[PDB]
């Protein structure tokens, strides 16, 4: 769950940016914690597929998007340090250049130029295939470990 916030720098962290940060980080962690609180057993964990980003402020003027995405990376350490390792299992998918999405719809035209250096840009179906690859039984066991 993300809302589109754009043009918001450090000097314009506005109500939209604060609300977006709530959605992407605060209420996200609250949703995970609520699922944990309502899990009765320790033998059926939930695999949380976290939409991590590789660009933590590299483009800028994205409001608090980078803050939310990098804050999601603390769950990897908190899996060990807290009592919810057996209830939730963290699978952080650092999603790359996805084509057709609003976050990079303005950069579809430069997707080819990006790819020209031997780099891969993804369509929505390809991204879905890759993230569904994180739900295979082997990766599920790996997340549980």
């Amino acid at each position: 769950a993300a809302i589109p916030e754009n043009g918001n720098g450090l000097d314009n962290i506005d109500s939209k940016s604060e609300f977006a940060h709530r959605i992407m980080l605060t209420n996200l962690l609250r949703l995970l914690g609520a699922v944990k609180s309502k899990k009765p057993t320790d033998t059926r964990p939930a695999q949380c597929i976290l939409p991590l980003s590789p660009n933590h402020g590299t483009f800028g003027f994205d409001g608090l998007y980078s803050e939310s995405k990098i804050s999601l990376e603390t769950l990897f350490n908190r899996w060990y340090s807290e009592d919810w390792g057996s209830k939730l299992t963290v699978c952080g998918a650092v999603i790359g250049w996805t084509r057709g999405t609003g976050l990079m719809s303005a950069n579809n035209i430069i997707a080819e130029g990006i790819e020209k250096l031997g780099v891969r840009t993804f369509s929505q179906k390809e991204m879905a295939f890759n993230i569904l690859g994180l739900l295979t039984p082997e990766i599920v066991q790996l997340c549980q470990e």
């Binding site: 057993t41 320790d42 033998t43 059926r44 057996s86 549980q144």
Partner: protein, 63 residues
Amino acid sequence: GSQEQGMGMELYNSSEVAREVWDKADRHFVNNYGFSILDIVQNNPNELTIHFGGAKGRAIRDN
């Protein structure tokens, strides 16, 4: 021959030692076999699903 629902639960609620016996048994069952014998006795469900996810669940599966 006699396995009626809720047998021994009066003693379970009244005596600390019966509580200890049932609690030890239920904890062992939950940890090593994935079910609660107290739940089985109190509720008598028709079907019960055991889940083998996680490290404890895989230990239960190996059991």
